Each structure stands twice: as C-alpha cells, then as structure tokens.
Amino acid sequence: AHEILIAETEAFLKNVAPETRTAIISAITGGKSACKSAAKLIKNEHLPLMSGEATTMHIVMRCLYPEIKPWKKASDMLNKATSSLKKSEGRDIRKQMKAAGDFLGVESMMKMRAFRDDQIMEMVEEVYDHPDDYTPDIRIGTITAWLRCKNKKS
Ligand SMILES: [Mg+2]
Ligand SMILES: [Mg+2]
C-alpha cells in the first residue's frame, strides 16, 4: 500500500519546496540506500522542515526500512504522546494491529473503534519503536492511516 503511502507523504509535504519535496520523495522511493541517506539528512535537520515535519518523515522512512536507527527526537515524542496509556491498553492495541492485517484493516480499526489520538499514536509508536514485530503491510498501513488522518485536518 506503499503507493498510497507515497501519495499521503506527498500531500503531507505539499507546503515544502518542490526540489526539497522531490528530494525526499525520490529518495524514499529510490531503494534502501537512498532512503537511509534521506533519513540521515532528516535527522540532522539540514532541510528547512518544522520539527514535527522532520519527526514525521523519519517515522515514515524507518517504517519503510527498519535498518534505519531510531531518532531520539521522534522516539521521545511518541513516548510523551502516549504516556497516559495503561500497559493493558497498549497490549490490546498490539493485538488489534496485528489482526488488522493491512492498510484497509488498520484504517478500519482506527475508525470503527473510534480511537483517540493517543491510541493512534501508540500504533505509530509500535511500528517506530518495534518495526520488526510487524509485517511491512502493517507498518505501511499504520503510517499511511496516520498520515491520512493528519492530511484530513488540512
Ligand atoms: Mg517509545
Ligand atoms: Mg507508548
């Protein structure tokens, strides 16, 4: 569903410059080495992105290629954003994510269970903190659904 992911990332980045957006999108669709390089560029904050835009893009990139190490700024952010969740609540979310299977499943899970922002964000934290615990379909689906949610507020 990486095609839909790319589309949502493009929309998420609509307000940045072309070359810049083009540089990011071209890299993330350019293979593992290209995406890795783009993630390093992102975390070093050389591009003129807002803090939230940079962390969002690093999450997208690590979700695509989990060999990319975690950026503390993004990691810490997801921790704070979900700090009010009981461990039991997160346990339920892990199971439900897995059972969701793919993008359509994950989107449906978020909507039909009327998830709060913190619950959505716990799904994103699961894929960012523990990408290897989830299939590519779940990682991409979760991040796509998350980006779709944000873009609908634009
Ligand atoms: Mg965490
Ligand atoms: Mg958490």
Residue numbers in the entry: 2 to 155
Q: What does the published report state?
A:
M1 from influenza C virus (M1-C) has been shown to be the key component in inducing the formation of protrusions, called cord-like structures (CLS), emanating out of infected cells and in regulating their growth thus demonstrating a role for M1-C in membrane remodeling. We show that the N-terminal domain of M1-C adopts a similar fold as M1-A, despite the low sequence homology of both proteins, but coordinates two Mg2+ ions which increases the positive surface charge and may thus facilitate electrostatic interactions with negatively charged membranes. Full length M1-C adopts an elongated structure that tends to polymerize into ring-like or filamentous structures via lateral interactions of M1-C protomers. Our study thus confirms that M1-C assembly on membranes constitutes the driving force for influenza C virus bud formation.
We solved the crystal structure of C-terminally truncated M1-C, (NTD, residues 1–155) by single anomalous dispersion (SAD) techniques to a resolution of 1.5 Å. The structure is composed of a tandem repeat of two four-helical bundles (helices 1–4 and 6–9) that are connected by a long linker containing helix 5. Interactions between the two four helical bundles and with the linker are hydrophobic as in the case of M1-A structures28293139. The overall fold is similar to known M1-A NTD crystal structures28293139, albeit their low sequence homology. Major changes are observed for the position of helix 6, which moves approximately 10 Å outwards. A notable difference between the M1-A and M1-C structures is the unexpected coordination of 2 Mg2+ ions by helix 5 residues. The first Mg2+ ion is coordinated by Asn80, Asp130, Glu126 and three water molecules and the second Mg2+ ion interacts with Thr83, Glu123, Glu126 and three water molecules. Nevertheless the presence of Mg2+ may not have a structural role since circular dichroism showed no difference in melting temperature (TM = 62 °C) in the presence or absence of EDTA (ethylenediaminetetraacetic acid). However, the presence of the two Mg2+ ions changes the electrostatic potential of the M1-C surface. In the absence of Mg2+ this surface is substantially less positively charged, while in the presence of Mg2+, the basic charge distribution is similar to that of M1-A.
